[PDB]
Structures are given as structure tokens and as C-alpha cells.
Design a protein around this ligand. Structure first.
Ligand SMILES: Cc1nc2c(c(C)c(C)n2Cc2cnn(C)c2)c(-c2ccc(Cl)cc2)c1[C@H](OC(C)(C)C)C(=O)O
Ligand SMILES: Cc1nc2c(c(C)c(C)n2Cc2cnn(C)c2)c(-c2ccc(Cl)cc2)c1[C@H](OC(C)(C)C)C(=O)O
Lengths: 132, 132
């Protein structure tokens, strides 16, 4: 798929919100725990993702998340335009005993996902690099 | 330089702590605002960085930051072993008026730094990909 398409969704676990970004063409994931499922957390997350990877278009399974003027401004500033969450939840449960806070287990699961085999982290760098 | 060497340092601005990670061979930066300059924030940051990029060795200008058992455990789990901050502070001041919170301005400055020209974000993907 195109090298700039990211899918972004907000999932739940242990009463907390986990925002999951997936590089469609590669399966590479960037996920974080946020205190609330607000537009301010989404906007701030998009600004982080955009500055680290080429984010050209963003898709979601809940269009209402991209309706806040806060989120639209972030998409405007970064020049952004408009399944996997169970695989991650699977990994989180496997490593959940190794961590106290859920945020730590989430990052443990992101590490495992991106580096497990080529791997998702290896495909994205090859895709983004090929396009360059 | 080697494709897995990252430099990590904790800088200050507006009474808050900004942790800055720099991919030595490329100049690519990942930076975030943390509430306090504690080992728990460092460890959690390392776990995030490691899961998104190949982090093999980490250097710092303050060795005492890597002495906490909390940080050493993160380095252990992720298989990690053991100038730029002014360029970023320069960009943060330029865009500071465009944001209320310092964390937003930091990510704005990371975006600008990595994508400004090849750019730092383009060199890192070419370096990591070449090594693959
Ligand atoms: C909350 C926490 N405290 C920790 C550690 C460690 C290793 C120590 C010694 N302590 C103090 C302690 C624990 N028990 N006692 C009696 C004292 C870790 C940790 C877990 C896995 C990895 Cl790879 C790396 C660090 C965490 C993790 O949180 C972060 C935010 C990452 C620090 C978490 O969520 O478990
Ligand atoms: C705190 C904040 N509130 C915001 C916005 C926006 C665009 C609106 C409308 N509001 C509500 C508002 C502001 N004034 N009034 C009277 C009502 C942004 C922002 C700034 C730059 C970008 Cl590219 C994208 C969003 C932020 C930033 O914080 C994050 C954590 C990113 C949300 C920040 O630090 O400025």
C-alpha cells in the first residue's frame, strides 16, 4: 500500500484507553496509553507520529474522533489528510505479568510486535526508504 | 556511524524536563516532556524508543542517569548496552508562540528538525535500511 497511510484507533483495557497507530502497508505499530479518549490526546499523538514518520493520510474505524477542531488543527499543521488491536491485546496479556503499569506492558508488546518476524519494523523502513 | 547508537540526555526549559534522544549517525531526534527527571521516566522512554527503532547501544553526557536498577532493567529487557539540544531549543523558541503547552512546541520542533533538509528522517531510514 501507499507508504504514508496510517490507521489510528482508540481501544480499551483495564479501564484505560490505548491509542493504536498502524502503518497499513507494513503492520508497524506505535501505541500509547492516554488518560482519556479526548481530542487533545489524539491531536498531540498525531503531532508526535507525524514528526517521526511520514504521515500523509490517516484512517480510523471511528470517524467521529477526527471531528474536533483540536485534531483538525494538528492534521492541518503537519499537512495530514483523511484486527491489529487484537494481536496487540494478545501480546499485552502474555507480557502483562512482567510489568506493574499497563503502559509498560503496552510498550513491551509494541516492541515484540514490531521486531518479530521480515518483521514489521523491517518492512516499514524498507518501504519508506524505497519511496525515497 | 553504527546504525544502533543513540545519545540520550535530559535538558530543561520553563521549569520542565525535556528528554532528548538523538540517532548519532543520522541526527534524527525523538524528544518528549517528562514530569520529573527520574529513572522511571528514563526507563519507560527507553522501552518506547527500543520498540520503534533498533536501539543497540545508548550514550549520554550524564552517566549517573543510567545507574538506577529501573533503567538497567529496561536496558536488559530490550537488549540494550551502554550540540543537538541547542538546535532543538532554537526551534522550540521559534514555534513557541504557536502552542500553549511546552510539550506541543517540543513535538512541533521535533517534526521540523527531522524533516528539514537529505533530512535527518530520510538519513535514518536509509541507514537502518542499508544495514538490513
Ligand atoms: C513501576 C516500575 N517499577 C520498577 C521497575 C523495576 C525494574 C524496578 C526495580 N522497579 C521498582 C520496584 C518494583 N518492585 N519493587 C519492590 C520495587 C519497572 C520495570 C519493569 C519492566 C522493565 Cl523492562 C523495566 C522497568 C517498573 C515499570 O514501570 C516503569 C514506568 C517502566 C518504571 C512497571 O510498570 O513495572
Ligand atoms: C492545549 C491546546 N488547545 C487547543 C488547540 C487547538 C487547535 C484548539 C482549538 N484548542 C482549544 C482552544 C485554544 N484556545 N481556545 C480559546 C480554545 C491546541 C493545538 C495547537 C497546535 C496544533 Cl498543530 C494542534 C492543536 C492545543 C495544544 O495542546 C494539545 C495537547 C496539542 C491539544 C497546545 O499546547 O496549544
Amino acid at each position: 500500500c501507499s507508504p504514508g497511510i496510517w490507521q489510528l484507533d482508540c481501544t480499551h483495557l483495564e479501564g484505560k484507553v490505548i491509542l493504536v497507530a498502524v502503518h497499513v502497508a507494513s503492520g508497524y505499530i506505535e501505541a500509547e496509553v492516554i488518560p482519556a479518549e479526548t481530542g487533545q490526546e489524539t491531536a498531540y499523538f498525531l503531532l508526535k507520529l507525524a514528526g517521526r514518520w511520514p504521515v500523509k493520510t490517516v484512517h480510523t474505524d471511528n470517524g467521529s474522533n477526527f471531528t474536533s477542531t483540536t485534531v483538525k488543527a494538528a492534521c492541518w499543521w503537519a499537512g495530514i489528510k483523511q484486527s491489529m488491536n487484537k494481536e496487540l491485546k494478545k501480546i499485552i496479556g502474555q507480557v502483562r505479568d512482567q510489568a506493574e503499569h499497563l503502559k509498560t506492558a503496552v510498550q513491551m508488546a509494541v516492541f515484540i510486535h514490531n521486531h518479530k518476524r521480515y518483521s514489521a519494523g523491517e518492512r516499514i523502513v524498507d518501504i519508506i526508504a524505497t519511496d525515497i
